[PDB]
Design a protein around this ligand. Structure first.
Ligand SMILES: Cc1cn([C@H]2C[C@H](OP(=O)(O)O)[C@@H](COP(=O)(O)O)O2)c(=O)[nH]c1=O
Ligand SMILES: [Ca+2]
Length: 130
């Protein structure tokens, strides 16, 4: 059973990275289980635009750590992000703006859910699957 924690938006960076204030400290978060294209690659600006709009227009932003590692080798926080109850990780995957990726042992609680969303976008030929 994972628990959602409060956080405040500092700055949207790109499709799967955002700078948030967590427990009073500035911290860069990398979204769990996803991989959006870099700004330079195809659909990159769209992914960044999608995330940016989604978090900037949210009234409440929550983070949810998984069971395994909470920080990556680059010092980034690893979590599931929620914009007014809606999981940003899943939304990106549902729109075909992100691919399910970097599935490590112990940090894959929401894996099936995201795989489900991917299969839908894949069948609908959304963005990346066009
Ligand atoms: C999503 C995720 C990424 N990472 C690391 C793997 C990648 O390192 P390597 O570059 O050394 O492969 C990097 C991918 O992040 P980005 O896609 O932001 O570049 O972040 C983790 O260690 N754990 C995770 O859960
Ligand atoms: Ca990426």
């Amino acid at each position: 059973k994972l628990h959602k924690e409060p956080a405040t938006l500092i700055k949207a960076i790109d499709g799967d990275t955002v700078k948030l204030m967590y427990k009073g400290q500035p911290m860069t978060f990398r979204l769990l289980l996803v991989d959006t294209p870099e700004f330079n690659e195809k659909y990159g600006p769209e992914a960044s635009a999608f995330t940016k709009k989604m978090v900037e227009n949210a009234k409440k932003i929550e983070v949810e750590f998984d069971k395994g590692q909470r920080t990556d080798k680059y010092g980034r926080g690893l979590a599931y992000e929620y914009a007014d109850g809606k999981m940003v990780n899943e939304a990106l995957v549902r729109q075909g703006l992100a691919k399910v990726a970097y599935v490590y042992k112990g940090n894959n609680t929401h894996e099936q859910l995201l795989r489900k969303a991917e299969a839908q976008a894949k069948k609908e030929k959304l963005n990346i699957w066009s």
